Amino acid sequence: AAACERALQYKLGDKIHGFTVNQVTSVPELFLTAVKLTHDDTGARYLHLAREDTNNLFSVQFRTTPMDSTGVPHILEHTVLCGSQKYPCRDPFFKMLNRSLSTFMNAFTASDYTLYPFSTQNPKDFQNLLSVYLDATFFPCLRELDFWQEGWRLEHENPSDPQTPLVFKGVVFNEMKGAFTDNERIFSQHLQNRLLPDHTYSVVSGGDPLCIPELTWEQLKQFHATHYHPSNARFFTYGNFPLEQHLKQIHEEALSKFQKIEPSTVVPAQTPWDKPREFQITCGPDSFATDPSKQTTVSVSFLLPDITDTFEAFTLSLLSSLLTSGPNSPFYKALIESGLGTDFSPDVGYNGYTREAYFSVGLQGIVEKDIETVRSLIDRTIDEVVEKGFEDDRIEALLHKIEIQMKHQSTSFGLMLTSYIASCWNHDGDPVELLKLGNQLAKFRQCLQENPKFLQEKVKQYFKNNQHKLTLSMRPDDKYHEKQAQVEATKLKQKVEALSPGDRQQIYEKGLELRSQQSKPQDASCLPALKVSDIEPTIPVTELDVVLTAGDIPVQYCAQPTNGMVYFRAFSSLNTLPEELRPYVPLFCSVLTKLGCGLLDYREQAQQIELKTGGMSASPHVLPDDSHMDTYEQGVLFSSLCLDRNLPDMMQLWSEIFNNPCFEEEEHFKVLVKMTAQELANGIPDSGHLYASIRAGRTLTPAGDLQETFSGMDQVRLMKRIAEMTDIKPILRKLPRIKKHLLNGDNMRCSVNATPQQMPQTEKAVEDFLRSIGRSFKPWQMKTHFLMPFPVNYVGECIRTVPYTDPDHASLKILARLMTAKFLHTEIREKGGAYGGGAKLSHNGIFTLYSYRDPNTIETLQSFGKAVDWAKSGKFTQQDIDEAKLSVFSTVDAPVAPSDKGMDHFLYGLSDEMKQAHREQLFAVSHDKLLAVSDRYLGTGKSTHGLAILGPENPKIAKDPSWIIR
């Protein structure tokens, strides 16, 4: 107390638990002081961030250097989360997922480094997880069966019949099939492979499905013994929990067992190229749009200097942002309205994941004959910028955007910190140096004001003068995945043929022991744990005050320490709008702040918003009632941000938007609609679970009906249909129809969060705004298939439950978390082989079953039937109800930002009263209430069902007449 104030007392040279204070430096603009220490005997490098935020976070880092496309480090992660010396219990990870009040909980394997992050708010639990991951990373029991489990292994379709064929399975196999399901990821990964073909950067670290089966247990264990030495370990901490305790635990627990070695993990530099090359590659089709010729993507990439010289890398990042961000940026001006493509390529702008940064730029969806056209345009635009450079207002707009990024306060801030620092600290950079952001801006302004032509000459050096240029053209192949299946079966037959009958018996026996492992309920009593008694009883109350102004519009002010940041939100109902125009409303949400306003054209309004604001976005929301299925609230939320000083101007922009937006630029309108059509078309895989949830619930709830109209596959389908229309003017006749019903104050409410010192001025500005605006069921079961060209599956089952305020809601919440933790997690992930699939209950009281990338389909349906059967059986313990209470508390008590707390009152009208009552009811949750509610709603014949599927073809589903094919 304070975190920085105590951290300042650390003196250089202090010997503490085998470490020595090496540097302590305060970063006041981030309101913390960073301290880095080193292990004296082994030399282990450590970084701490001490900042007065309760949500403490820990992660560790290893420099991971694969030399092949087998994916050894990524699978190595997936194994070392499943068992270690000191906690040899089976799968420590997903059990501790049911043990925590953690805020974020997973791990990534990046291209050249591996990171194990977690974040939580309870100190003793933090110590527990500290011990668990240090032991899991450093002393993992590396059983060959786990090697089989998370990596690659051959088993019969039924592990009990040694007569059915052996096939490749393992979670990593399906996960890499999915990772290369996306064409955008194909393009990215191939790009890294091509640009730096000299070393480990030339391989696919995540793992090529065509190369994984080549890994043997001996190779994996050799890799782990080679790379996981403490001398290759990076420790990074952020939060407020006392540091010396961290030192005590780590020193006396892990580091004592090893001695100094030197990792032979230095990454050599890419040799400079002298001449460009050109390459043409194939990828997968589109979902599921038109013009099989107008699907071509092209890019040019450029080598950048080493990123350890931080300032110039920052400089070049800003230059990239100048080059590509916003519809007033040059390459936008040359490319977008050229009618040549549909939007910017993947990986636009500065991309610094690897050692050596690269610039990228390009388009999607062209005709391949224009690749030379595109690159010629690139060269000409580059030269034009060389000769004239950029307008200074765009400089200031970028600087204002970076400043806003500097002060914005996240709910997962530590993860942001670690992801932004990971690469540099990995490659022997000085991690404090990226933290000196204010310093960066200072020298940035200095360098701009000293040279008018600095920016143009930098473009010269690093685009026109680098012979290390590479141009990539990328076209889809309709039989790409057919080719993949061919080569997969080919490798499969060669690998099965080389197997001896004794080898085949060992394989079958080990499959037998594997599903035995997956079947036996085992203990984790050696794991530490919490109890329901360990949760604080009450929440700190959230302060509100409702001030009716002009003359009945409620406005909320919440004094907060946001560091000079103003947060505005506004929501208008839709009750008067004629229902036929609802499906086009989402576009109205998406573009209304993007069409131009009054005396400002699209370029000028964009320049002003990006110069003064932080982002001005609209996305429609449907708010259900808490106590009635046939009552719900539908409307649009406008959201924004500014620093305190620039508020009046922003709100002025809001006013001129509300009264006179420019609805006549239909050309740039067509461009925007076709481009957002492109992102909705190419984003489909990543949120398939949500799309299925939405589709399955369409015929179940009026709130479900309007959400489906607003945010589902129906919406993207309508959008694509629109984006192919040649004549838009009838649609342009629709916009004023909406405007005349939307932006007024007839049925309006607004919300404001601001710093305490600021409210009086905000009140004047907002009343100016408000004076400146006008003042004139039967559920029915459906089964649906979207024929998707995908190697994986997405299933949705929804069952109509009852809303929030019924006391059984707590029961159903614990039931859902229970089912996920103890039936569906086991079956669906480890037995089934899908990476993700589970069940959740939304605030709307709709109980959902979801699947994310499952190789299996009908076994899923059988698994859900058996899951509800098992729930109704009661065949589960009271300790599990304890732990599911614990996890539900881990979700509902998620840290809430200065920016969001509490939006849910302003949205749903739920006070602290109802939620606190729900929290006491969660304390009081019993076994008999759970069994009663499970008998009341989840039993067969009691409720209405809804079913949906997105994925490849299934003849069995196709021959079912009670299924509808879509």
The CATH number assigned to the domain holding 649 equals 3.30.830.10
Told to judge if 77 belongs to the known catalytic residues of this protein, a careful annotator would answer yes
Q: What is the 3-state secondary structure (H, E, C) of 516-549?
A: HHHHCCCCCCCCCCCCHHHCCCCCCCCCCCEEEE
**With b meaning 16 or more CB within 10 Å and e meaning fewer, what string describes 179-190?**
bbbbbbbbbbbb
Q: Three-state SS string across 94-157, please? A: HHHCCCCCEEEECCEECCCEEEEEEEECCHHHHHHHHHHHHHHHHCCCCCHHHHHHHHCEEECC
Q: Where in 577-715 does DSSP place strands (E)?
A: 617-624, 632-643
Do the domain assignments include residue 866? no
Tell me the two tokens of residue 108: 């990534």
Shared domain check, 283 and 214: no
User: Does residue 157 carry a catalytic annotation?
Assistant: no
Which tokens sit at 286?
Answer: 């589109």
**How far from the centroid of its chain's Cα atoms is residue 744's Cα?**
35
Residue ending a domain, among 771, 794, 824, is 771
- Domain count across the chain: 3
CB-neighbour burial class of residue 599 (10 A; exposed 0-12, middle 13-18, buried 19+): exposed
Range(s) of the domain holding residue 13: 3-257
Q: Which residues contact 918 (CB under 8 A, 6 or more apart)?
A: 804, 809, 810
Asked if 153 and 90 sit in the same domain, the reply is yes
Residues contacting 509, CB < 8 A, separation 6+ = none
- Residues 126, 52 within the same domain: yes
Please give the Cα distance from 783 to 700 (Å, whole number): 12
Residue 65 is encoded by which pair of tokens?
Answer: 């250097």
| CA distance linking residue 411 with residue 57, whole number of Å | 12
Residues 816 and 508 sit within 8 Å (Cβ to Cβ): no
Structure-token pair, residue 904: 């849910």
Residue that terminates a domain, selected from 771, 793, 827? 771
Residues 243 and 287 placed together within one structural domain of the fold: no
Residue 918 among known ligand-binding residues: no
The verdict on 166 and 129 lying in the same domain is yes
Q: Which of 257, 290, 310 is the last residue of a domain?
A: 257
How far is the C-alpha of 90 from the C-alpha of 87, rounded, in Å?
Answer: 8
253 is in an annotated binding site: no
CA-based nearest residue to 519, from 197, 826, 130? 826
Q: Which two tokens stand for residue 814?
A: 């614990």
Give yes or no for a contact between 325 and 398, defined as CB atoms under 8 angstroms apart.
yes
Clarify whether residues 369 and 426 are in a common domain: yes
Tokens in use for 18? Answer: 């085998």
Q: Which of 29, 144, 150, 497 is catalytic?
A: 150
Alpha helices, DSSP H, located in 240-301: 243-253
Instruction: Please report the DSSP string for 54-106 in residue order.
Output: S-EEEEEEEE----STT-HHHHHHHHHTS--SSS-SS-HHHHHTTS--EEEE-
Taking alpha carbons only, the member of 526, 659, 540, 646 closest to residue 592 is 659
Q: How far apart are CA 189 and CA 283, in angstroms?
A: 12
Sign of torsion over alpha carbons 599, 604, 605, 611: negative
> Quick check: is 654 in a domain?
yes
Is 719 found in the same domain as 676?
yes
Could you tell me how far CA 49 lies from the centroid of its own chain? 24
Residue 601 class from Cβ within 10 Å (0-12 exposed, 13-18 middle, 19+ buried)?
middle
Determined by: cryo-EM
Q: Give the pair of three-digit tokens for residue 248.
A: 């005590």
DSSP 451-518: -TTHHHHHHIIIIIS-S-EEEEEEEE-TTHHHHHHHHHHHHHHHHHHT--HHHHHHHHHHHHHHHHHH
**Cβ neighbours around 625 below 10 Å, total:** 17
From the candidates 77, 155, 708, 830, which is the catalytic residue?
A: 77
Contacts for 87-91: CB closer than 8 Å, 24+ residues apart: 87/132, 87/135, 87/136, 87/526, 87/527, 88/141, 89/522, 89/523, 89/524, 89/526, 89/527, 90/517, 90/522
Classify residue 582: in a domain, yes or no: yes
Q: Are residues 567 and 752 in contact, defined by beta-carbon separation less than 8 angstroms?
A: yes
Question: Per the structure block, which two tokens stand in for 367?
Answer: 């005709």
**Could you give the count of Cα atoms lying within 13 Å of 95 in the half-sphere of its Cβ?**
23
Do 593 and 562 share a structural domain?
yes
Nearest to 659 by CA among 576, 743, 603, 596: 743
What are the phi and psi torsion angles at 533 (to 5°)?
A: -65, -15
- Annotate 494-524 with b (16+ C-beta within 10 A) or e (fewer): eeeeeeeeeeeeebbebbeebeebeeeeeeb
Q: And the tokens for 489? A: 């079966």
Give CA–CA dist 60/235, Å, rounded. Answer: 5
Token pair 């009281």 in the structure block, residue: 845
HEC sequence for 337-353: HHCCCCCECCCCEEECC
Contact 203, 16 (CB under 8 A): no
CA distance 491 to 489: 6
CA dihedral for 42, 44, 50, 54, sign (positive or negative): negative
For 646, half-sphere exposure in the C-beta direction (CA atoms, 13 angstrom radius) is 21
* Statement to judge: residues 295 and 247 lie in one domain: no
The answer to the question of whether 843 is labelled as a binding residue is no
Q: Are 62 and 229 in contact (CB under 8 A)?
A: no
Residue reference for tokens 């302003």: 906
* Among candidate residues 878, 959, 960, 860, the one with its CA nearest the CA of residue 925: 878
Element (H, E) at 571: strand 565-573
- Give residue numbers after which the chain breaks (C–N above 2.5 Å): 776
Pick the closest to residue 219 from 116, 66, 108 (CA basis): 66
Q: Which of 154, 936, 253 is nearest to 496 (CA)?
A: 154
Residues 6+ apart with CB under 8 A from 621: 571, 634, 635, 636, 637, 907
Q: Is residue 636 part of a domain?
A: yes
Q: Are residues 381 and 409 in the same domain?
A: yes
Distance of CA 923 to the CA centre of its chain: 32
Are 253 and 283 contained in the same domain? no
Measured distance CA(929)–CA(897) in Å, rounded: 34
| Alpha-carbon gap, residue 618 to 636, rounded angstroms | 7
> Does residue 189 sit in the same domain as residue 293?
no
